[PDB]
Amino acid sequence: ELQEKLIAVNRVSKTVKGGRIFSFTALTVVGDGNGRVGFGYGKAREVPAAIQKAMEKARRNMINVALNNGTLQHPVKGVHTGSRVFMQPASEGTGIIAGGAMRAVLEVAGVHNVLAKAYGSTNPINVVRATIDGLENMNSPEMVAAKRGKSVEEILG
Amino acid sequence: GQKVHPNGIRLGIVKPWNSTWFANTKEFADNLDSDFKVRQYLTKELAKASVSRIVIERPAKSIRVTIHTARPGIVIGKKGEDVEKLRKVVADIAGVPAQINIAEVRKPELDAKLVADSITSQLERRVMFRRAMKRAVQNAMRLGAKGIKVEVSGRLGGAEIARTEWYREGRVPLHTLRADIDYNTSEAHTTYGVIGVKVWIFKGEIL
Amino acid sequence: MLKAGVHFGHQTRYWNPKMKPFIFGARNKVHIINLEKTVPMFNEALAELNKIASRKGKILFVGTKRAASEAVKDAALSCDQFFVNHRWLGGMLTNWKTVRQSIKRLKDLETQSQDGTFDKLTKKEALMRTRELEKLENSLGGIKDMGGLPDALFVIDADHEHIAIKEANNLGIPVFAIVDTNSDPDGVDFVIPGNDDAIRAVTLYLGAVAATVREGRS
RNA sequence: GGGCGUAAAGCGCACGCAGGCGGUUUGUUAAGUCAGAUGUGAAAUCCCCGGGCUCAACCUGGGAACUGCAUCUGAUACUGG
RNA sequence: AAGGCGGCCCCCUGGACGAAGACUGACGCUCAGGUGCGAAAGCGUGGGGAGCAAACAGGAUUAGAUACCCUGGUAGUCCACGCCGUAAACGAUGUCGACUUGGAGGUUGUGCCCUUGAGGCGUGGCUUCCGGAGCUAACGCGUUAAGUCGACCGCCUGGGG
RNA sequence: GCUGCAUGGCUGUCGUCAGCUCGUGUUGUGAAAUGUUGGGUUAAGUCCCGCAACGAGCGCAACCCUUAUCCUUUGUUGCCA
RNA sequence: GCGGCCCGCCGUAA
Known part of the structure; x- marks a missing residue:
C-alpha cells in the first residue's frame, strides 16, 4: 500500500594503495496515501543491495503531514544548507508542477493540487529535504486557534 | 598463479583417489593411455547425464569402472541395453573383461x-x-x-x-x-x- | 522528604546553567539543591512507574560508577527487576538483535559448567573457557535471560550515562534519572534532582524505588 | 527577487558642507496620507456575456477594464510644518 | 583614531576613565564632492658619518655561480627644512544604537562589612582564552558575534587580456 | 600463418611481507569515519587492560612430511651378544 | 647541531 520511488543512483569511488575501489549509493523516498512520508539514503557495494538497503531504512522513519483534499492552504517557504525551496497551494484541476525530486515527494505525500518552484542548487539530496523544509512546520488551521485560545470561526474571520 | 591446488595437497590425508591399482614401470604408459581413453569416451556420450567422476580399478587381472551420477535412470537408460553396449564397446577398447557399476549422487x-x-x-x-x-x-x-x-x-x-x-x-x-x-x-x-x-x-x- | 540526609550539588565552578530553577543560594561556594521542590514531582513520578510495574514494566537500573555500583544490584532482583553494573556497551538496545546472540552464547556455555571438562580433560581449554564465561557474565549478569526491549529505565547519573539516555530517546523509552548540578534535563524528563555522588542518598533513593515498585504487581 | 572573514567584493585612517535619517510629549495644522462623489482616460484592440457566416478563423451587439489625471467635500491614527 | 610610541631630568600641551553633585534642554547618527594625518624605501638643499650595508671588487663552492659562505666596501640608515602619498597600511571582518545561557583570568577606579592580611559582599572601563543556543558550504564565530534588528555610506558580477 | 592491448588455464612479482575486509548500530548534508584506535606485550591484527562499538571472514599459528630419545610386533637376502 | 648533488617526449585500460 505504501508508495516507494527511486530517484538517484551514482557511483562513488575511494582510493587506496592497491588502486581505486568503487561503490554505489541510492536515494529513495517512501510515502503513504494521505500524509505519511519518509526518505532513506543507503550505501552499498552493488546497486540492488543499495536499493534493498535504502528501502527499509526509509520505511522506519515515516512522518505525518496535515492536508485537506490533496493540499493545505499555506504559503510555505523552506530553506536548507545549500538549497532553497518554495511552494504554495493550488486551486483545483491543476496537476502537480514541480522539479524532479519535488514531483516524486509531493506525489507520494498525498498532495494533488500544489504549485512549487526550486531555487538554488539542484542536487537531489538537499532538495529532498522539501519534506522537512515546510511540511514538518506546516501549520494546522485549528491548531493556531487552539494555541491562541480561540475558536476556528474567529481565526477564519 | 598464487594459490596451491587444494585437491593435490590433500590427496593422501583426507581424500580418496580416482584410479587405484598397481602396475610396474613397464606397463605404466599403456595402462594410463587406456585409463584416459576409457574416461574420455565415457564422458562424451554421458554428458547429458549428471556424471560427477569416473573410478577405474585393476584387480591385477581385470578392468572395472564406477560411475557416480544423480540421474541413474538415463545412465542405465530403459534397461541394461545401454550398459551392455557400454561394456561391449569398452571391451573393444580394452580386451580384458569389464564391469560397469553405477553410484548415486543424493x-x-x-x-x-x-x-x-x-x-x-x-x-x-x-x-x-x-x-x-x-x-x-x-x-x-x-x-x-x-x-x-x-x-x-x-x-x-x-x-x-x-x-x-x-x-x-x-x-x-x-x-x-x-x-x-x-x-x-x-x-x-x-x-x-x-x-x-x-x-x-x-x-x-x-x- | 524532611530527614535532610541528602547532600547537594558538586560546586558552583562546575555547574550547568540549564538548572537555574532547581538551585538554592550558595553560602560556602557550593550549590545547594531545592529540596522543597524535589519532593513533589519525585513522588508524582514514583506514581506512574509504580503503576507501570502493574503492566510488567521490566524496568532496568544503571549504576556503573562505583559509588552506587554495589547498591544498584541490591535493589535490583528485589522483586523482579534487572540491572547492568560494568561496561555499559554502546548500542546494546539499538543493536539488540546482535548482542542477543551473546546472551545465547552464555546460555550455551553455562551448561558446559556441568560437562565441559569431562567431555575432554585438556587443561588448556579449561582456564580460557572459564575466563571467557566469567567475562561474559560480568557485564551481562542482570540481563542473562531478558526477552529484550525493556519498557522503563532508571538512571543513577545522567551525564556519566548520557550514552544510555541518548539510546533511550530514539526508541521512545521513558527515563527516570537522578540529575546533579552538572548534568541537564534532556531525555524523558522524569527528573529526580538529588546528589548522585553520595552513598547515603543513592541508597535512600534505591530503597524508596524498590519499595514503590514492589506493590506495582500486587 | 542577490552578496562583501577564506570563493568577486569594507576606502590606510580621521574631520566635515550639501544630502538621508530623527528621544518623549501637548495644542493647532490638513502638506503627504486615508474615504467618498463629480469630469475625463477617443475610437480601435484584450477579457466576459452572447450572436451570423455549414462551426471556424472573419464580422457584430452589450458589460468589464481603460490601473492614470483633474475638481469639491470628509477622515487627522501616522509622517511633515 | 590609524601609521606608531621605551635610559634619566626639566618646560609647553592633548585625550580617555572613575565616585558624587550642579547646570543646558534634542543642540543627535552617517556622509558623494572637499580637508588633514599616513611604515619602509625614494627625491631636493645644508651638516654628520661609529656600526651595518644595496651597487661594486677580490676569495671560495659548483658542470657553470651571475647566488647562498668568507674578506673588503660607496649611496643609505642620523640631524634641520621641504616633497612623495604607497604597504599582507590584516582582525584579509566599515561607522553608530538596541536585545540574547556561562565562565576562567589580566590591568585600572570606587563602596561596605572584623577591612586585621592576601578575607569575603559588591560595583564601572578596557583587555586574554574556552565555550551553549543560534548562524555558516565547511573551516569556524560566539556579549569585544560571522546570533536577532534599525540608520547612513563604500564596493561585487566567469578566467585571461 | 596474424592478433597476450579481445581471451581459459599456467607462472614470475612485491612477499611467508602481516596485513586486508564485511554484518548491524551509532557520527557527519556529503565523499567517508568507527570497529582495525590508546597502555603493555608477540615472530605475527599473538594476546591482556581501556574505549560507541558489538560481532564476523580471508589472513597468523596448528593440524602435513622428514629428522633428533627411548617403548612395543617380527627376523631374510638383514645382526653376531 | 650545518660542504654538495640536475632532468624524465606526444596520446593512450571503463
Missing part, C-alpha cells in the same frame, strides 16, 4: 563439478551472470554447508578486459588441510570466448 547441488556444469549450461543460453551464480550459492547454502565460494573470469559480454568476481559465505579455510573442500572447474565455448568457472564447497572438517 544432492545434485553438492558435487561442485555438477553445479559448475549447471551454471555453465545456464550461461550457454545468454543469461546475465549475476543471477546464475547467485542462485547457485543460495541453493548451496540452503542445503547446509559451512562454506561456499564461486569464481568466474572472462569476456562477460563486453569488449573491455576480462574481469573476475566472487561471492562467498561461511568459512572456507584453505590453509587447514583436515578441512574437506570439493573443488572443480568447467568452461563454456561462448561466442565472445572461453569462460572458466571455479567452485569451492566446505562440507566440514574430517577428524
Whole structure:
C-alpha cells in the first residue's frame, strides 16, 4: 500500500594503495496515501543491495503531514544548507508542477493540487529535504486557534 | 598463479583417489593411455547425464569402472541395453573383461563439478551472470554447508578486459588441510570466448 | 522528604546553567539543591512507574560508577527487576538483535559448567573457557535471560550515562534519572534532582524505588 | 527577487558642507496620507456575456477594464510644518 | 583614531576613565564632492658619518655561480627644512544604537562589612582564552558575534587580456 | 600463418611481507569515519587492560612430511651378544 | 647541531 520511488543512483569511488575501489549509493523516498512520508539514503557495494538497503531504512522513519483534499492552504517557504525551496497551494484541476525530486515527494505525500518552484542548487539530496523544509512546520488551521485560545470561526474571520 | 591446488595437497590425508591399482614401470604408459581413453569416451556420450567422476580399478587381472551420477535412470537408460553396449564397446577398447557399476549422487547441488556444469549450461543460453551464480550459492547454502565460494573470469559480454568476481559465505579455510573442500572447474565455448568457472564447497572438517 | 540526609550539588565552578530553577543560594561556594521542590514531582513520578510495574514494566537500573555500583544490584532482583553494573556497551538496545546472540552464547556455555571438562580433560581449554564465561557474565549478569526491549529505565547519573539516555530517546523509552548540578534535563524528563555522588542518598533513593515498585504487581 | 572573514567584493585612517535619517510629549495644522462623489482616460484592440457566416478563423451587439489625471467635500491614527 | 610610541631630568600641551553633585534642554547618527594625518624605501638643499650595508671588487663552492659562505666596501640608515602619498597600511571582518545561557583570568577606579592580611559582599572601563543556543558550504564565530534588528555610506558580477 | 592491448588455464612479482575486509548500530548534508584506535606485550591484527562499538571472514599459528630419545610386533637376502 | 648533488617526449585500460 505504501508508495516507494527511486530517484538517484551514482557511483562513488575511494582510493587506496592497491588502486581505486568503487561503490554505489541510492536515494529513495517512501510515502503513504494521505500524509505519511519518509526518505532513506543507503550505501552499498552493488546497486540492488543499495536499493534493498535504502528501502527499509526509509520505511522506519515515516512522518505525518496535515492536508485537506490533496493540499493545505499555506504559503510555505523552506530553506536548507545549500538549497532553497518554495511552494504554495493550488486551486483545483491543476496537476502537480514541480522539479524532479519535488514531483516524486509531493506525489507520494498525498498532495494533488500544489504549485512549487526550486531555487538554488539542484542536487537531489538537499532538495529532498522539501519534506522537512515546510511540511514538518506546516501549520494546522485549528491548531493556531487552539494555541491562541480561540475558536476556528474567529481565526477564519 | 598464487594459490596451491587444494585437491593435490590433500590427496593422501583426507581424500580418496580416482584410479587405484598397481602396475610396474613397464606397463605404466599403456595402462594410463587406456585409463584416459576409457574416461574420455565415457564422458562424451554421458554428458547429458549428471556424471560427477569416473573410478577405474585393476584387480591385477581385470578392468572395472564406477560411475557416480544423480540421474541413474538415463545412465542405465530403459534397461541394461545401454550398459551392455557400454561394456561391449569398452571391451573393444580394452580386451580384458569389464564391469560397469553405477553410484548415486543424493544432492545434485553438492558435487561442485555438477553445479559448475549447471551454471555453465545456464550461461550457454545468454543469461546475465549475476543471477546464475547467485542462485547457485543460495541453493548451496540452503542445503547446509559451512562454506561456499564461486569464481568466474572472462569476456562477460563486453569488449573491455576480462574481469573476475566472487561471492562467498561461511568459512572456507584453505590453509587447514583436515578441512574437506570439493573443488572443480568447467568452461563454456561462448561466442565472445572461453569462460572458466571455479567452485569451492566446505562440507566440514574430517577428524 | 524532611530527614535532610541528602547532600547537594558538586560546586558552583562546575555547574550547568540549564538548572537555574532547581538551585538554592550558595553560602560556602557550593550549590545547594531545592529540596522543597524535589519532593513533589519525585513522588508524582514514583506514581506512574509504580503503576507501570502493574503492566510488567521490566524496568532496568544503571549504576556503573562505583559509588552506587554495589547498591544498584541490591535493589535490583528485589522483586523482579534487572540491572547492568560494568561496561555499559554502546548500542546494546539499538543493536539488540546482535548482542542477543551473546546472551545465547552464555546460555550455551553455562551448561558446559556441568560437562565441559569431562567431555575432554585438556587443561588448556579449561582456564580460557572459564575466563571467557566469567567475562561474559560480568557485564551481562542482570540481563542473562531478558526477552529484550525493556519498557522503563532508571538512571543513577545522567551525564556519566548520557550514552544510555541518548539510546533511550530514539526508541521512545521513558527515563527516570537522578540529575546533579552538572548534568541537564534532556531525555524523558522524569527528573529526580538529588546528589548522585553520595552513598547515603543513592541508597535512600534505591530503597524508596524498590519499595514503590514492589506493590506495582500486587 | 542577490552578496562583501577564506570563493568577486569594507576606502590606510580621521574631520566635515550639501544630502538621508530623527528621544518623549501637548495644542493647532490638513502638506503627504486615508474615504467618498463629480469630469475625463477617443475610437480601435484584450477579457466576459452572447450572436451570423455549414462551426471556424472573419464580422457584430452589450458589460468589464481603460490601473492614470483633474475638481469639491470628509477622515487627522501616522509622517511633515 | 590609524601609521606608531621605551635610559634619566626639566618646560609647553592633548585625550580617555572613575565616585558624587550642579547646570543646558534634542543642540543627535552617517556622509558623494572637499580637508588633514599616513611604515619602509625614494627625491631636493645644508651638516654628520661609529656600526651595518644595496651597487661594486677580490676569495671560495659548483658542470657553470651571475647566488647562498668568507674578506673588503660607496649611496643609505642620523640631524634641520621641504616633497612623495604607497604597504599582507590584516582582525584579509566599515561607522553608530538596541536585545540574547556561562565562565576562567589580566590591568585600572570606587563602596561596605572584623577591612586585621592576601578575607569575603559588591560595583564601572578596557583587555586574554574556552565555550551553549543560534548562524555558516565547511573551516569556524560566539556579549569585544560571522546570533536577532534599525540608520547612513563604500564596493561585487566567469578566467585571461 | 596474424592478433597476450579481445581471451581459459599456467607462472614470475612485491612477499611467508602481516596485513586486508564485511554484518548491524551509532557520527557527519556529503565523499567517508568507527570497529582495525590508546597502555603493555608477540615472530605475527599473538594476546591482556581501556574505549560507541558489538560481532564476523580471508589472513597468523596448528593440524602435513622428514629428522633428533627411548617403548612395543617380527627376523631374510638383514645382526653376531 | 650545518660542504654538495640536475632532468624524465606526444596520446593512450571503463
